[PDB]
Design a protein around this motif. Structure first.
Motif, short mmCIF file in Angstrom:
data_model
loop_
_atom_site.label_atom_id
_atom_site.label_comp_id
_atom_site.label_asym_id
_atom_site.label_seq_id
_atom_site.Cartn_x
_atom_site.Cartn_y
_atom_site.Cartn_z
N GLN A 1 30.84 39.02 39.95
CA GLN A 1 30.69 37.72 39.29
C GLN A 1 29.36 37.59 38.56
O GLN A 1 28.33 38.10 39.02
N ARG A 2 29.38 36.90 37.43
CA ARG A 2 28.16 36.65 36.67
C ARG A 2 27.49 35.56 37.50
O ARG A 2 28.13 34.58 37.87
N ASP A 3 26.21 35.75 37.80
CA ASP A 3 25.48 34.80 38.63
C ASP A 3 24.41 34.01 37.87
O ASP A 3 23.34 34.53 37.57
N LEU B 1 28.94 30.61 39.70
CA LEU B 1 29.37 32.00 39.68
C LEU B 1 30.63 32.10 38.83
O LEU B 1 31.53 31.28 38.95
N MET B 2 30.68 33.11 37.97
CA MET B 2 31.82 33.31 37.11
C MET B 2 32.42 34.69 37.37
O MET B 2 31.82 35.71 37.03
N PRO B 3 33.61 34.74 37.99
CA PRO B 3 34.24 36.03 38.27
C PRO B 3 34.51 36.83 37.01
O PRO B 3 34.93 36.28 35.98
N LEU B 4 34.25 38.13 37.09
CA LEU B 4 34.49 39.06 35.98
C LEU B 4 35.53 40.00 36.56
O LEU B 4 35.20 40.98 37.22
N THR B 5 36.80 39.68 36.31
CA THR B 5 37.92 40.43 36.87
C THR B 5 38.57 41.55 36.07
O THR B 5 39.36 42.31 36.62
N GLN C 1 28.42 25.71 35.79
CA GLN C 1 28.81 27.05 36.20
C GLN C 1 27.79 27.69 37.15
O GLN C 1 26.61 27.81 36.83
N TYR D 1 24.35 40.07 37.97
CA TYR D 1 25.70 40.40 38.44
C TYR D 1 25.71 40.47 39.96
O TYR D 1 24.99 41.27 40.57
N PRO E 1 38.48 38.35 42.61
CA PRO E 1 37.53 37.47 41.92
C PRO E 1 36.10 37.54 42.46
O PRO E 1 35.13 37.47 41.70
N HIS E 2 35.97 37.67 43.78
CA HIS E 2 34.66 37.71 44.40
C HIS E 2 33.98 39.08 44.32
O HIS E 2 32.80 39.19 44.65
#
Ligand SMILES: O=C(O)[C@@H]1O[C@@H](O)[C@H](OS(=O)(=O)O)[C@@H](O)[C@@H]1O[C@H]1O[C@H](COS(=O)(=O)O)[C@@H](O[C@@H]2O[C@@H](C(=O)O)[C@@H](O[C@H]3O[C@H](COS(=O)(=O)O)[C@@H](O[C@@H]4O[C@@H](C(=O)O)[C@@H](O[C@H]5O[C@H](COS(=O)(=O)O)[C@@H](O[C@@H]6O[C@@H](C(=O)O)[C@@H](O[C@H]7O[C@H](COS(=O)(=O)O)[C@@H](O)[C@H](O)[C@H]7NS(=O)(=O)O)[C@H](O)[C@H]6OS(=O)(=O)O)[C@H](OS(=O)(=O)O)[C@H]5NS(=O)(=O)O)[C@H](O)[C@H]4OS(=O)(=O)O)[C@H](O)[C@H]3NS(=O)(=O)O)[C@H](O)[C@H]2OS(=O)(=O)O)[C@H](O)[C@H]1NS(=O)(=O)O
Ligand code: CA
Length: 370
Positions: free
Chosen positions: A40-42, A4-8, A2, A53, A36-37
């Motif tokens: 995102q959790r980085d 970048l994880m999008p936080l939508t 993982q 973030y 999505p972009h």
């Protein structure tokens, strides 16, 4: 692995309680565009051992309207203030329902400080070298909490309505931001009343009907970039019912530092400014902010006691620890003459009708008493 994880997930904090799956890291909810972009959790950029973030608004990510016709703005932020289902557990169903209508749901949630209190705030930001020097964005702001049951009648008289009286008014008035319009039943081509996702009636905004409710208003404090400058701006509004037409707002480039721009009821102060090129890049900068909120006289509309702002800017340079006392215990007017206090937010709030791309990271928020 993982990256970048999008936080939508997004929450309308004024009109809805946050569901458990929408809460981020147990203390945040996101607001603004859900691309999505956008947020995102980085995992590639840790701050204090935790993924940070990453916020980003591309050129076409503006989805909001400014005060001036045609103007637009963009939003992708985290709010430290929101209500949860647990906040309404055990109460009659109508408490939450009326809170949605008065848009005071977050009054029942954690995250806000009281009027005239003293608080310490801390957060960190990471600005990559890729950020254009001419962006127009606020990366951290302390927002007010106006209660819309305080209204102005068509005649112009200011009145504090009860929740039930406001609910009554809302039945015949459609509010566009702070302005009331005749509530019109929205019909389809076949003149049939339209419903929504829950089978609830839908309406339309007719002509202005004279009513105004307290809503919006400049944030009492904001950290951002504008006109090639990093700046910190404080705002004060002592009027009992805020007048949105009074655009008293200091220009980072033109207003001298610590010399408030004033109107009858407002004061806007540039507490600090620095050329964008001098703001440290590609490293974590930690801001320690102490605020003594201005005390207002409510209906009297007086400044009972001035406020105070103190800001320290810490970062690593040349491998050495640096700490700049950028705002040194300055007496200042800061806050809003409301019953409720203020809450923190960070992320991207692209203003000035700008569409210049913005991308940077934020993390490590904390608040305490002093
Ligand atoms: O619906 C619809 O539409 C649709 O739906 C669907 O379909 C979709 O969605 S989804 O989601 O589904 O997808 C879509 O499609 C859509 O949606 C979308 O949209 C919507 C609508 O919109 S509109 O816009 O159209 O309306 C939305 O919704 C909405 O909205 C939202 C939002 O917004 O978000 C919400 O709201 C709410 O919330 C908010 C937020 O919060 S949270 O928590 O949530 O986050 C709130 O608040 C807001 O905001 C705030 C902030 O942020 O802060 C504020 O604002 C303000 O302040 C600012 C800042 O300040 S400072 O001080 O810092 O600065 C400002 O800005 C500024 O200022 C300006 C001015 O002044 O103008 C400038 O200044 C300049 O200029 C001046 C003037 O000049 S002349 O020439 O003109 O004369 C001068 O004087 C000076 O000097 C200058 N300066 S310089 O430097 O430039 O030179 C400045 O610049 C700026 O900035 S800076 O930094 O740069 O400085 C502002 O202004 S503006 O213009 O921008 O606007 C202010 N505003 S006011 O009004 O106050 O004035 C406030 O408070 C507010 O605002 S407002 O606008 O809003 O008011 C609020 O309050 C709330 N509300 S409630 O009711 O709730 O309470 C909600 O939701 C709604 O609302 S309503 O009303 O409608 O209900 C949504 O969201 C969307 N979605 S998406 O996704 O798309 O996104
Ligand atoms: Ca007020």
């Amino acid at each position: 692995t993982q990256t970048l994880m999008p936080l939508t997930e997004r929450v309308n904090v004024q009109a809805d309680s946050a569901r458990i799956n929408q809460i981020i890291d147990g203390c945040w909810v996101a607001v603004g565009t859900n691309k999505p972009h956008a947020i995102q959790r980085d995992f590639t950029n840790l701050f204090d051992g935790k993924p940070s973030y990453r916020f980003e608004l591309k050129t076409e990510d503006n989805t909001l309207e400014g005060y001036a016709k045609g103007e637009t703005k963009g939003r992708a932020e985290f709010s430290y203030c929101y209500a949860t289902s647990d906040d309404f557990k055990g109460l009659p169903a109508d408490v939450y329902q009326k809170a949605q209508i008065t848009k005071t749901v977050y009054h029942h949630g954690k995250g806000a400080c009281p009027q005239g209190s003293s608080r310490d705030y801390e957060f960190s930001v990471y600005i990559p070298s890729s950020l254009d020097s001419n962006v127009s964005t606020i990366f951290a702001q302390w927002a007010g909490m106006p209660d819309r049951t305080l209204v102005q009648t068509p005649q112009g008289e200011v009145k504090k309505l009860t929740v039930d009286e406001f609910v009554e008014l809302e039945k015949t008035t459609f509010f566009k931001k702070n302005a009331g319009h005749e509530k019109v039943v929205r019909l389809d081509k076949q003149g049939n009343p339209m419903k929504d996702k829950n089978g609830k009636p839908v309406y339309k905004a007719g002509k202005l009907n004279g009513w105004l409710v307290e809503q919006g208003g400049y944030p009492p404090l904001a950290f951002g970039f504008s006109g090639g400058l990093f700046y910190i701006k404080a705002n004060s509004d002592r009027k009992w019912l805020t007048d949105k037409d009074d655009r008293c707002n200091a220009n980072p480039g033109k207003t001298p530092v610590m010399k408030p721009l004033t109107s009858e009821y407002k004061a806007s102060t540039i507490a600090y400014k620095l050329p964008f090129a001098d703001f440290p890049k590609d490293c974590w900068i930690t801001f320690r902010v102490h605020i003594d909120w201005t005390v207002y006289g409510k209906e009297a509309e007086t400044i009972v006691k001035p406020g105070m702002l103190d800001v320290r800017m810490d970062y690593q340079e040349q491998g050495k620890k640096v700490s700049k006392h950028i705002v040194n215990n300055e007496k200042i007017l800061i806050g809003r003459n409301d019953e409720d206090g203020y809450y923190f937010k960070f992320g991207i709030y692209r203003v000035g009708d700008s569409t210049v791309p913005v991308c940077y990271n934020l993390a490590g928020y904390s608040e305490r008493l002093e």
